[PDB]
Each structure stands twice: as structure tokens, then as C-alpha cells.
Amino acid sequence: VLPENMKRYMGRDAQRMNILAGRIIAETVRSTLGPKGMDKMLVDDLGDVVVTNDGVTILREMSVEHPAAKMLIEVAKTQEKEVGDGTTTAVVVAGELLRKAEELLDQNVHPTIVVKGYQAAAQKAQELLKTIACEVGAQDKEILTKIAMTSITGKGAEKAKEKLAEIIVEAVSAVVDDEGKVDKDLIKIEKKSGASIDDTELIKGVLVDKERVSAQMPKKVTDAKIALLNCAIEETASEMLKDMVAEIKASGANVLFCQKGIDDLAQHYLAKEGIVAARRVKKSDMEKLAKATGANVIAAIAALSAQDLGDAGLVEERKISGDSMIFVEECKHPKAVTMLIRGTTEHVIEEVARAVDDAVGVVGCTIEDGRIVSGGGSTEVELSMKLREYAEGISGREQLAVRAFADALEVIPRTLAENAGLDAIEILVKVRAAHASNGNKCAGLNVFTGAVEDMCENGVVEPLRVKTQAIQSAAESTEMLLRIDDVIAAE
Amino acid sequence: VLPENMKRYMGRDAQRMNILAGRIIAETVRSTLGPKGMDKMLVDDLGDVVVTNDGVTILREMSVEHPAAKMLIEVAKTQEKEVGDGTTTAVVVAGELLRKAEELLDQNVHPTIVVKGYQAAAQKAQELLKTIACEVGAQDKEILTKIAMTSITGKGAEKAKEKLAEIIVEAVSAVVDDEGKVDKDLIKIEKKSGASIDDTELIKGVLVDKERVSAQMPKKVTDAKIALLNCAIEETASEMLKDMVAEIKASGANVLFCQKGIDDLAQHYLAKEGIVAARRVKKSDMEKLAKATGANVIAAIAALSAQDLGDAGLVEERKISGDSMIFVEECKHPKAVTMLIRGTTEHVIEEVARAVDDAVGVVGCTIEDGRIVSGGGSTEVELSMKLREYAEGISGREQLAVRAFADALEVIPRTLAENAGLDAIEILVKVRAAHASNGNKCAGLNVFTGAVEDMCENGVVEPLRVKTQAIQSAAESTEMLLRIDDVIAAE
Amino acid sequence: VLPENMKRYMGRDAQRMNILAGRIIAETVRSTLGPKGMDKMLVDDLGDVVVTNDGVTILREMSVEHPAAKMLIEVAKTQEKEVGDGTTTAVVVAGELLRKAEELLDQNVHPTIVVKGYQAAAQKAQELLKTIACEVGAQDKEILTKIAMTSITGKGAEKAKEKLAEIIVEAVSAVVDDEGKVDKDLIKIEKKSGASIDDTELIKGVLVDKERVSAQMPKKVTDAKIALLNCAIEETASEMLKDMVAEIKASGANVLFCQKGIDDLAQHYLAKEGIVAARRVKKSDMEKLAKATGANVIAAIAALSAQDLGDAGLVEERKISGDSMIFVEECKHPKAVTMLIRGTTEHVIEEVARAVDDAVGVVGCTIEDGRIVSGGGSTEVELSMKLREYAEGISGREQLAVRAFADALEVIPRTLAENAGLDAIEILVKVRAAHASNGNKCAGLNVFTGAVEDMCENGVVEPLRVKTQAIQSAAESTEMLLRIDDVIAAE
Amino acid sequence: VLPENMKRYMGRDAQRMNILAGRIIAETVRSTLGPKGMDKMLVDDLGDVVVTNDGVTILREMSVEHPAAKMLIEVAKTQEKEVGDGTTTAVVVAGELLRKAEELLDQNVHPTIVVKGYQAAAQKAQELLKTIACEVGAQDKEILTKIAMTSITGKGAEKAKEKLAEIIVEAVSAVVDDEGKVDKDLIKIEKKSGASIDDTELIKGVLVDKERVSAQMPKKVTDAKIALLNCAIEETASEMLKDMVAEIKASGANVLFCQKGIDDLAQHYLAKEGIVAARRVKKSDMEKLAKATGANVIAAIAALSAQDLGDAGLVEERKISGDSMIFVEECKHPKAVTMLIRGTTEHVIEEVARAVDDAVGVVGCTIEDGRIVSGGGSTEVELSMKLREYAEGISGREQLAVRAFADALEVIPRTLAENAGLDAIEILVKVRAAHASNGNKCAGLNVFTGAVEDMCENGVVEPLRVKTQAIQSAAESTEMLLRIDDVIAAE
């Protein structure tokens, strides 16, 4: 039926096969866990080399075959859609949770007991997270930079984490509009090598990596009237093409962004009419320009009127690290901003671009949801403490799964310290002792100095939503696996 | 003749081969039997992963080769066409019934005796079901929610089974029209992630997952005049295309649903005329809109007149979980309603969508047929009791098959308790003892607590039709097999 | 010469090969012999599963290779063309007749003797059948239902054999026209699941499984003027297509049956003119409609005139088991009727449809030929008795073949009782004893109770033609084989 | 040079190879020899099964490879072209004649002696046949039915040989025209199942298996004006096609036979003009109709005039065994007649059709040549007697071949009696004794009773031409072989 080399497992072997498939990914990602964790280099058939620490990105780029690992990927994609960050943590938690479930199955605990115990403990776990959640001001500069920096740290770019936090916090508050909802789509991530990471700046306008199509055209336009055409400026015969250019002139437009190309013949006439133009404009760029300038993207020139033109106070061609780019600024009511990321190398600012793509997200989450929690594994410990007590009240066979559920959380405090090169046993004893006496607001592990520390005092915090989503996704994906006991695959 | 690997059986081996083919499916489905049963993950050649408990769906998606299993599938499809739910139960009953038939053949009971005895006992079985059938009010809220919840339970979504029963009972009574017949086609199943299961609501109108094709177009239309065109709004030259748009305007239409695409050039002119439009409308959507608004779907614009326009009090673009959808509501006499299913994950509400597709069905059956019966295997036990007495009066060789027929019903009480992890022997003794003394309205097994209970008191009931169809289909499909003694297959 | 695997026989081996080829089919069909016989499931390369007891149908669907079995098929097709029923009996009789012929060849009886003896005994056999033939009234309700029921019995549908006999007897007398000839082509066999077998009814008009192509069109037409066009209602441009519709209107036609499709544009204009239409009409349907309404099927609209329109008192769209069908009734002089077969399942009424296709045939034969005979093997016994006496008068070597010819008839009394599970020896002794003393009108075997009974008293009779055709075809096909002693096949 | 499997013989081995090749066919046909002989079933690659006794037909249908057997086939085709019947006899005589020649070659008789002796004896053999030839009246009813019946006997259809002889004798005398020559092409052989062999009748007119193309057209035409067109009645546009129909009407034609198709549009207009039409008319049918009616087959309608129309008193559509056929009768001077052959089965009248194709031939030969001879091997014996005496006068080595030539004739008296199952030795002694004493008009073997009888008294005779052609063809084809001593074949 199947290619010679392909193997099949069934019944209890299908269960172990599935846990092992989950173990392959879970083991792969848990080595990237933490600020002191490693990264993966994925190299495709075409020679494209992608180096990252992002779990779902690794899972999207690599070649995963087994359905079990493919449903794990779906969980990783949920993590991205909801939080962005914590892609590793989510898989690691679910990984150990599955290991504990398989140990229960080995201990002759019926799958219906494992499911019940997990779903029970997860319901209380989220109640406990909401109980220990610390309320903060949605627009508090301090916590806004604390959330941001938490994600930033453990990266080479953390040398400028103060500048990075500044740019992201301001960008979020800029685009939040009302009080409030943060739409990431209002902030563009633009990256150009040159200068360093400290130089990165937020530009309240639209910056595109385009130049003025002809050396004969003006290098700047003031009180700019922006026209957006998706139809190429290409017409046979210079008489009709000239009329086209005269029609663009007739609109009162001074700046022309064409999604498609512009014929060299048209570029001559466009220059004669004093019209500055940029061709081959990205679909995204056409949209950002419409958002900022209020320009209306027109299909057919016949539909283009003076009322379809957008406004910009100044559209100017500027050079950065030698490269000519167009800055669209001083717009009446720009609904888009551009973050210009600087750095010593393209590949460095490629990492920064992704790092801040997350940071700008989690800061927005912190504003939208005014509950944050301490990091360094403090919450996971709190949950281990209280759920162990709950397990005793629950009793029966269910107490077996509930105890394992709570204990599963210890893979994070442990593997974190393991990647830090710390004593797995002693760290866990000293952290749990310090947590138990001092509290959750006086705990967690600082792998940066290699000692138990007050994570909250040190500004090591993360949104409640991140923590509760991690529990939600992990628990329901574990139950998902547990619900399946028969795999029917086509050839 | 046949590919090396393919095997052939003949005569008595063809009989055993056929029973074994039926055993393969019957064994596969009986593991999914009950609220505490498992589910199957079917993964095709393209990577599509489908996780379900539905028997016929499993049989449609999987690759079945043997003609015997393919005719079993036809039985499973009959179960869907008639009842929807109970796809597993029907196969399991028929499975054991075939096993009992093969035991009779082993006991040297002529196939004509097995057929006669089964057809005889099945005739009395349906008389017995009609005898024990409990009459209920067709519009009794209580029994309507009891039928609904019976199907709902054993699912993760049962946490909100009260909300789900509420939505389905109201939806059925809404579309029933006269007293009465329930047409499922009048209720749309729409599912969008966001919120939870408690939030699911019934919208007396038509909701489609479409947006306003241009940002320039109005976001809502009051006293809406809906036009339905299946011809794409695509015409070479802006003069003729403009005339087309002017012709749509001429109708008095304000809302335009086009089954095909709308050219960007047309979208400009449509906006200029204040016409709101949605393109690429699904064939189903074009029909639901015609049903609700009374709009007449027009092929050629030449045929479109003002008399072909449908009415809606308000057609409005609303965002749900960020996604823009069109709500068509306040129609004069809407003949279609939309059930908007909410939940924390797309894959969760994918299961809810199917769960309520059945629930809305069986509630409609309960209204149309005012007879319901107790669940938990109580009927199957009653039948075992009375048919054993009947068997004694029948006598001859026929009594052998009649006794086996009645005993075959015990696979359900047994496998149910087996999936529950209960004592197969003791449960059956305690249930049959409790049934015999207390009655059928004071019996059945509650696998939810793992004890014999009053299923009727607990609202664990199902339509008589479900139970009688299970007997009808199983008995005639067993006889079908029994009638065939020679398999003639092409290469 | 031939593919490795293919075998060749010659001379006396060609004779045995041919008898064995005849034995393969004869043995296959004799297991289906009788009301208590079995059926065959034929499954082709495409997955099509056909379950039947009809001999020629089995022979048409299966893959027969040997020329000898292919000429046997030709005999089976003659049986269908003449009688319809008795497809098994004919082959079984010929099968044993060939076995007896091969025994004679083994006994060193020259093929010219075997041929002479068979042709001699067959000439007297038909004289004997005409001698014992019982004359009945051509329009006697009683014998008409007896002939019908004889064919019907031994089927699951026999539970309603009284309703079925009623429908067929009335349908035959309805279409017989003069006194008389019954043309089966005047009775349509239509089958729709829903209800049961008792509900089957005869509709003196034409019922087609078509709906009203548009929801805008009238759902019924009174004093209907039916138009029949085989040209599709498809014309480029709405001006010419409108003129086409106006031309149909001009005819005075109110109902339009188009053999081909109808363009959606035309469906709009057709509705505007109040013309009801059905497209994709089957070639057969176009003919039945012409027969009933007297409508003239027109190729080109140019040829269509008001004189070409047929009449129906009422053409109405009605729903049955939910499905929309068109009933064409109250026609002035309908020359076609439709039998609407009801039942609990499509596959059940698929069997009923074939069962009554035969029943309506043999009743027509009984009317056309006023001679019928008793069943249960009574005639075959009578023939064994008298031909044994004739054999003695004939003498010589010819008497050897004549004795074997008469004895060959015993395969039917025997295999019938064998399929019934009765004593092959004792049954034959008790039947022949009862026949010899009481007569042919006081004999035959009742396999329904498993005892010798008066088949005539019990209404177990069949047309003389059936019995005499069985002898004619079997004898001449045996002689056919006997005449061939050399097989010359191409590669 | 040649495919592995192919063999080559040379010199004396080429001679034996050639005799063996002739023996293969000669042995194959001699089993079909006589009224009590067998037949052959030839089955091709497409599944076509042809059962016959005709030698040349067997040789045409089978696959013959060897050049020697292929030249034997040419002899068999000469037999058909000249006589028709006696295809077996001719080969058998030549077969033994070749065997006797090979025995002579074995006896060291030079091929020049074998040739000389055969050519010598064959010259006297034909003189002897003309000497014993019995003169009969060319139009003597009695001998005309005797010749006919001789060919007819030994067939299942001989039960009606009196009816068959009647039809053929009348048909021949009908078409003979002058005194005389019989042209078989003037008699059509038409066969339709239904009725029996006694019912076969001769229709002095033309019967074709065609119907009236439209139900709207007249079913009969009196004083019919027949038009013959080989151009299809197919014209784009109804205006030009109508003019075409009007042009046919203009001719005065009432009946139209079109060799090609007739468009449905034309069939409408043809009916409106009262023109009856039949399409797809066979090329042969177009010719027979021209012969009978005197109608002139026209290519282009432009060439069709009123003078080209043929006459028939009545052209009428009649049903036979249900099938609609056209009878063209009462023509002024019909030059064609149709023999309508009836019978219980298509395959039976397929044999009758060929049987009478010969019978009508040999009766014509008997009229054209007023010499006939006795059958039953009487002539062959006479020749053995006289040629033995001649051999003695001839002497030398030539006498060896001449003796063998005469003795070769004994294969017919012998193999005939062998197929009859009679004593090969005793029969030949009793026949030769009876012949020698009583004469040739008082001899021959009657295989029908299995005794020597007076063949002439019993009406067992055949045309002299048949007998003399058998000698001519056999002798010259033997010499042909004898003349070749070297076979040069291409790869």
C-alpha cells in the first residue's frame, strides 16, 4: 500500500507514535526556549538560508510529514494569530503535558480520566492566572517599555532595547486611535542597513523604497497632490500617450504612484508636465499611500478625477545609506506610520524587524488588556502550588491526571534553567521555596545572572492573555490528541 | 485475472468473507459508540485532516474497496438521509445481527430460516417500539430541548448545551411555517471563531461572509432594494460599462449581489451611483437572498426590471472578530434564517456546526412525529425481553433465528458500557433486572455517572422514528446480504 | 498462437469442453431456481453493484468468454424477447438435457441418434403440453391475478402481491385497446421511494420526473396546450431569443417540453409570457408525451404550428416524497399510462420495477393466448410419464435418447426441491405418485409449505406459451450444440 | 530468414508438405460431407460466431496460411462461382485424388505419368458423364422440385422442403424471362423471424425492411410515383430546404427513397406535401427499386424530372412480426421479386436463406442445361467401372495413374457411408454389385434409411454440370499441384 520505507503503527502504538511525533517538535523547540536558548538554520532546496528562533516559522519552513506534527503546527499558528511571541513556550508546555498523559496511559489511566483531569485543572489554572494577574495602566509608559523589553531581551540588539522600546511604545500609542484598539497594520516595518540599532526612528508618514523614475523630474513636491493608478502608463503611439499624460495633468495631480510600469516615452512627457512618478509600486504600498494621503486608487484613468487625489504636505526623494527613497509626510490626517529600522548589517535588521513585529503586538495587547503577570516561571510555579492542593480535593482517578497536569508546568522552569546551564534540581527547589514564602510578585528565575530574582522588580513581565492563551491552546490540543485513537490515512 | 495480492473467496468462504468485511466497519464504528466513545482522524493524500465521530462521513472519506462494505456504506447513507444522527448505532446493531446470522449458519441453520426468523422478529420489534412509544407535545419546549441535548451531550461543547438547545428549538419553530413540516434548508449554519459557545445566536435574516467591494461605497443601506445578478459585471470599454451601471441604477436597486466578479472599473461607477455591491457570491447565497428578500435572480440585465428587486429593511456591513460580513435583515417576509455559531477556535465551531446540523434535524422530527422513546439502551432491552417470549410461541427452526435476533440487541447495552469502562456482565444484569421490574420508562444506563438510571427522568430520549429506522435498515440490509450467495466481480 | 494460459480442446474433448461450458452457466443459474432460490451480486470495474435473479441479465452483465456459453446467452435472450420470465428454468432444462446428451455420447450413442431422439420427443412434448393445456377466459380477473402472483411470489414485495396484481391487471386491460394485443410500451414503469409497496398506483396519464424550470412560472396549467421541441431554447442576443419565445406564444402553447436545454435568458421571457417549461426532456419522454397528448414533436420552430400542439386537461407540478414531478393528465385520448411504484427504499422498488415489468408481460400473454398450465413441476412430470410410454413404441437406438430426453425434465422437480431443502428422492416419488393417480390438475410441489400440493387450486399457474417456448428453445439449442463437432477460432 | 516456429520443406518434402496441406482442408471438409454430415463453428477475434457446412465459406472465414491450401480455396471459390452447392464434394474428390497421386509418387511413378494418366481419365470421365446424363424437360415441375429438394435435404428445414421447392421453382420461372437464362440477381432473399418455414412466400414485387420516416406521413400510397435520390435531403436554412421539398413535389413524386439521410426539418415539410419518404436506403435497395418501378436514380435534384419517376400500383407500410416494412407491389413491369422467408428463429432462417440461395441456383442450371444425373454416388461408381476397363486398354505406366484416378472416386461412396455410420466395405460391395447389375438409374446409397436404393426413383438427382465441373476443377487443380516442384516464398 505504502512506499517501502514508510511505517505504520496502530492502537496503543498509534498513541505512542503520536506522542513521539509531538516529542520530535517539542524537543526541537525546547532548545530555543528562553533568552539564553539557541536558534535554528533552515536551508531549502533553492539555497535560501533562514536563521530564526520563532517556533511556527521553523514549523512553516521545515518539512513536516506526520499528521500529529501537522496539527501541532496548527497550534503554533494559533499562537502567532493570537499572541505572536511565546511560540516555543506553548509547544514545550504541550509537549510535557503530552508526556505526562502518556505516562498516565502507561500507568493504566483510562484516556477519559486523563482528558477529564486536564480539562478540570486547566479550568482552575485560568481562574488562578486571573487571580494573580496584576492590573496596570493601559497607557503607563513604564509597563509599556517593560512588556516590550521582555520580548526584546536575549537578542544581540538588546544593546539598544531602550531605543527600540521607545519607538514601539510611541508607534502603538500613535495608531491606537481610540481608547482603544491597536491595529498593527497601521505601522509599517521598514529596514535599511547603515548606522546602528540606536538610530532606528519612527516616521509619522509613509516611506517607500522607491526613487523618482527620471533624473529630469523634480526631486521633491510641496503641497503634493497624490494620484494612485494601478493601470500601467503604457500606450502605443505618442499622441494617445501624450493625451494620457495631459489627462493626469488635468486632474491637478503632481505625484503619481503607478502600481504597474511606466513606459520610457511616458516618463519623458510626465517630466515635461512637471509630474513626478514612481512605477512598479507594491500592492501594499498603493494601500498605505491611500490610507495616509486619502488618495483613491483608480483602475481606469476615465474614473480618475481631481476628487480622487490625496494630500501630502511634502513628498520628497531622500537618500539613506546612498539609496533613494520617497518620504510622504506632512499629510493632513495620515492613518499610517513607518518605522525606519537602522543597523550595521541587513541580516541584523532582518532580525530586528521580526523582533519589533512582535514587540509592537504585545504592547498593544497590554494596552487593550490591563492585566500583566511576572515572568521567569513564577506563574507556572504558583499554578503547580495551588493545583496540587486542588488535586487532593478532587480525588479519585481524576486526581492522578490533575497532579500530572500541574507537574507538567515544571518543564519550563527546568528547561529554561537547563539552557542557562544552571542546576535543574537546586534551581527548582530555590525558586519554589522563594515563591512559596515571598509570593509570585517576588519570584522567578533570572537566567541573565543565573539566580532566583524578583522578576516583577526587574520589569520581567508579560501580558496575562499570553499566559492564559498558552494554557488554553495547550490543554485543548492535548485533549484533541487524546480524543483520537484511530488514524485512517490514504496511500 | 486479478492483481497479485488480491484474494478471492467463494461459496461458504464468500459468506464468511462478507461477514468479515461487515465486521471491519462494524468494529471500527463501535469504538465511537456513545457519548464516551472515541473519534477517528482521516487524513487524505492532499494532507486534509478530518476528525469526526460520524459513521457515514468516516465511510465516505475513507477508502472502502469490498462491495460488502460498500453496501454497508449505502445503509449508513440511508441513516443520514432519514435521521442524520445514530450513524454508529445502526451499523453496530447490523454488525452483531450479521455475527448472529453467521453463528446460525455455523449451527447449520439454513439461510432461509435465518432470513425468515429475522424478518419475523423485526416485524414484531417495530410493533413493540410503537407500543412503548411515549407521546409528547409537538411544540413542548421541554421535550424539544431534551431531544436536542441528547444529541449534543458527550461533546466538549456540552458546557453550553442549554444555549445550543435554545437556538435550535427556536430556529426550528421559526421555519416550521405550518403545523407542520420542518425544512432544514430554511436554516443556515454559519460559523465564526471569536467569543465562546454560549454566545452563539440565531439571526432572523441572512448573514453572508462578504464585504462592501469598495471603501468608497456606503457601509449600510436602509429600505434596501436588493438586486440579484448571476452575470459578471464586466464589460469592455467604460462607455458601455457605465451604461450597464446606469441600467442597474435605473432599476431603483441600491444593493447588488453578483454571483460572478465585478470589474474594478465598474466598482468605481457603482460607487458613484451610490450602489453597494458584493461580488463572487456563492450560488447558495444567491438562493438564500432570493428566499429572504423575494429578490429575483436575473441572468441578463435585459431581463432585470424594478419588479425583480427584493426588499430588506436594512442591509449593513458589520465586523465580527474583525471580519467584515453583510447582514440582510428586517425583510418583509424572510423565508430564511441564519444561525451564527461562536466559539474560541475555528476547529471547535466546525464540530459545533455539524452537531447542530443534526440537532436541528431531530427536533424537527420530534415535532413532525409526536412519539419519542427513552435512551440508554432501555428500548433494546424491552425488545430482548418480549421477543424472547415471542420466540417460544414461534418455535421450529425459526425460533433459533428469532432468539438470536433479539439477543443481537445486547451489543449496544454492552459496547456502550464497554466504552464507558463498566462491567459488561454486571451492568447488563442490573439494567435488565431494573428494566424488568421498574419498566422501560424507569431504565437505561447512564454512562455519565456509570450506573443504571431513569433515562426518561434525566431527559435522555430520542425520536421513535430513529429507533424504528435503525431496526428497518439493519434488518433489511442483513437480509440483503443473506439473499446473496455468489459474488461475480469484473477484473 | 494463443496467450500462455489459454487452453484448447478438440474432437471429443471439444464436445466435453462445450458441455462443461454449458454446465458452468447451467450450474450458476440453477441455484437461483424457484421462489426459494438465491440471487447473484455482479460488481463491475467501475464499482456498479447489480443484485438480481434474472438469468439473461446476469449473463449480459457478467463476462462470458467461451463461444458455447455465448450461444447459451443467445438462448437466454430469446427467452427474454418471447416470455421475459423463466430465464433460469430454460437454462436449467437445457443444461440437464445437454448432460443427458453427453451421457448418451459416453454410452456410444451416435450424435445423429441423440439429435433424432430429442427432436422426436420434443415434437410430442409440445403436443402433450397443448393436450393438457387448460383454457381460461382472456379477461378473467381471477386467472389474471393468478398468473401475475405466480411471477410475483418468492420476493420480499409479495407482502403486497394483491396490490401489485391489481395494478398490473388493470394496466394491461387499459392499454390492450382491441381484443386484442397488449403492447408493454404503452405502460411506463416509474419508481419513487417513499410510502410502501401497498401504495403503488396506476395513473392514466404521463408522469415525468421533471419540475417547472423557473419559480416564476405557473405551477399548473389547465386546458393545457402541449408543445414538443427537440431544439434547445438557446439563441445568442435577447432580441432574437425574445422573438423565439413570442413565436412559441404565437402557437397558443402553454406547456413546453424541450428535449434539450433552455437558456436562463429564455426562462425569464418564457415566464413573462406565462409559458411553463421543462428542459433536458428524455427522448423517451418526448415520445410518451406525443402518444398521450397527440402533440407533434417538432425539430425547427419554423415547422411548429398551432396544429402541432397536443392536449391535456391538466398539467400540474406535484411533490412526491418532496420531489417535484409533472403530471400530465385528463388528456382527451391518452395512449400511454404511468405506473407509479412506491416503497420504503429506492433499491426495493428497483426490484419491484423489474418484477412488474415481467408480470405485466405474462398477464398480456395470458390474455392473448387463452391457455395456461399448472406450475410446481406438474407439466414436467406429465411429460416424463407419457414420453416414457412413447419411447417404448419408438424403440431402436432412438428410444435411448427419447428416454433420456423425458428423464431430463426431472432436474426441475429435483433442483426446485433441493433449493427448498426437501428430500430430492422422496419428494419426486410422492409428486409422481400423486400426479399419476390424481392428475396434472391435482399435482406439483409447493415449496412454500414444503409438501406436494394442488398447484391449480392454489393459483400456481403459468401461460402455456412459457412452457412450450422453454421446450422449443432448449431442444433446438441442444441440437445446435450437437450439430457442431469442430471449433475454428481466430487468435 | 523466417520467424522462429516457421518450418520449410523442399524437393520431395515440398511435395509431401503440399499434399499434407491439401489433406488438412480435405479432411476438415469430408466430415461435413453429405446430408448426415456435420457442420463447423467459426469464431473470429471480434466474437462473431458463424456456423455453417459450406466449404468455401469455411475457407473464406477461417485463417489459411499455406499457399497450397490458399490455391485449394481458389478451387472452392470456382465451385461457388459456377455451381454454388457441392463445395465439400469437390474438395473431397480432389483430396483423395491428391492422396492417390502421392501414392503413385511413392511407387516411383514419375509426376509426368501421374499428370498424363489423370488428364487422360478425366477426358473420358466427362465423356462418360455426358453418356449417362439423363435428359429432362427444362420446365418440368417434377424434376424442378427434385433438384431443389436434393440440395434442401439433410437440414432441419427439410420438414417444409415441399413449400421451399414450390417457392424456388416459381421464383426461377418468374425471373427466367426468355427460354432462357436465370439471373439470381432478379430474386431477393429476405428473412424475418416469426411464423414457421411453411409460411415462407414469394412476393412478386420489392420488399424492403424500411418504415415511413414520420408518423405524420401517409402509411400507403396508391398509383405510386417513386422517386430515387442518392443525395441526402439535408439543406441549411428552411427556406432553401422547403424549396427542395417543393421541387420534389413539383416532379409529381409521391414516394421518395433517399439513399442517404433525411433531415428532421425536411421530414416535416415532406409530410406537409403528402410525400412519404424512407431514408438511409441501401445501395442494393436503390437498384432493386429502379429495376421494379423503372425509377431512375438521380444524383442531383437539378437532374430529377417527372420522366425519372417509376411506377408502382401500391406502395404500403405493413407490419410483420411487429416490424414495419415497405411493400412495393402492383408495378407495371417489375423486373425484381422478393422471397420472404419465415421461421421460428432468426438463426434458423439465416440457414434457410443460404440453403435457398443455392437451391434457386441449381434449379436455374437444370432449366438452362436439360441434363441431370442420379446422386447417392451412382455416377462415381459408373466411372470407377468404365475407367478401370479403359485403364487396361491404355496400358504402360499411364495405366497405373488411370487406375488410381478411377479408384479415387470411391472416397465419396465411402466417406458418405462413413458419416452415415454404415459399413464402409459392405456398403461399397452392395452398391457396386447393385450398380453393375441394375444400372446407374437403379443405384446409389440412401443414407436416410442406411441402405442401397434407387436414387432416381427417390428423386435424388443433381445437374450434370455439377458433376462435370467437379471433375474439371478437381483434375486441373491436381495437375496444377503436380506441375509445381519448387516453392519460392518471400520472408
Side-chain angles (χ1 to χ4, degrees), chain A residues 299 482-483 486 488 490-491, chain B residues 38-41 43 45 268:
Chain A
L482 291 171
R483 290 176 178 277
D486 190 356
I488 301 170
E491 293 85 356
Chain B
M38 305 302 286
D39 65 53
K40 311 292 179 180
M41 182 178 75
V43 182
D45 192 56
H268 291 315

Side-chain angles (χ1 to χ4, degrees), chain D residues 87-231:
Chain D
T87 59
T88 298
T89 298
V91 175
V92 173
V93 171
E96 182 57 52
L97 183 57
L98 288 172
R99 288 189 291 270
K100 288 281 189 280
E102 194 274 347
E103 289 171 356
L104 290 169
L105 264 40
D106 187 60
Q107 293 279 256
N108 204 52
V109 178
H110 190 290
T112 200
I113 298 299
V114 174
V115 169
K116 178 67 170 75
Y118 287 5
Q119 183 58 240
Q123 291 297 321
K124 287 288 92 183
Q126 290 180 358
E127 291 300 312
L128 266 34
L129 289 172
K130 290 187 290 185
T131 298
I132 65 173
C134 180
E135 289 188 347
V136 298
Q139 288 299 122
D140 175 69
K141 189 76 172 180
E142 183 180 307
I143 197 65
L144 260 32
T145 59
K146 287 176 173 170
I147 295 292
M149 285 177 181
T150 300
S151 184
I152 292 168
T153 55
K155 202 78 165 172
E158 72 180 359
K159 64 176 74 174
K161 69 185 192 298
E162 297 80 7
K163 285 69 177 174
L164 291 172
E166 187 68 51
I167 297 300
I168 270 68
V169 170
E170 291 290 349
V172 170
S173 291
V175 302
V176 73
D177 289 308
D178 210 354
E179 297 177 3
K181 199 272 169 281
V182 180
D183 181 355
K184 193 172 77 70
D185 195 57
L186 305 179
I187 301 168
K188 210 268 172 191
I189 305 301
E190 178 58 61
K191 65 179 165 65
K192 294 290 301 177
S193 61
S196 192
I197 303 303
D198 292 309
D199 308 79
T200 294
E201 67 182 356
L202 178 66
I203 302 169
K204 281 75 174 297
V206 178
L207 168 63
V208 298
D209 63 317
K210 274 80 198 172
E211 57 185 306
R212 302 293 169 87
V213 71
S214 170
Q216 185 176 355
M217 291 178 182
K219 281 181 77 69
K220 62 195 294 174
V221 178
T222 61
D223 194 43
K225 305 297 291 186
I226 289 76
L228 300 179
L229 295 176
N230 63 51
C231 181

Side-chain angles (χ1 to χ4, degrees), chain B residues 67 70-71 74 110 112 119 123 296-300 302-303 305 308 472 476 482-491, chain C residues 28 36 38-45 47 49 51 58 62 154 156 159 216 238 264-265 268-269 272 344-345 347 419:
Chain B
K70 288 180 177 178
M71 293 300 99
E74 290 284 344
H110 190 290
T112 201
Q119 183 58 240
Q123 291 297 321
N296 182 23
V297 177
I298 300 299
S305 69
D308 295 309
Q472 180 67 52
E476 68 182 59
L482 291 171
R483 290 176 178 277
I484 301 165
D485 200 7
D486 190 356
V487 181
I488 301 170
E491 293 85 356
Chain C
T28 297
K36 261 79 182 303
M38 304 302 286
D39 65 53
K40 311 292 179 180
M41 182 178 75
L42 283 69
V43 182
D44 69 15
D45 192 56
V49 180
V51 179
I58 292 166
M62 73 181 291
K159 64 175 74 174
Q216 185 176 355
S238 65
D264 293 313
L265 208 178
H268 291 315
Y269 291 164
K272 288 182 186 296
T344 195
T345 298
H347 291 309
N419 287 342

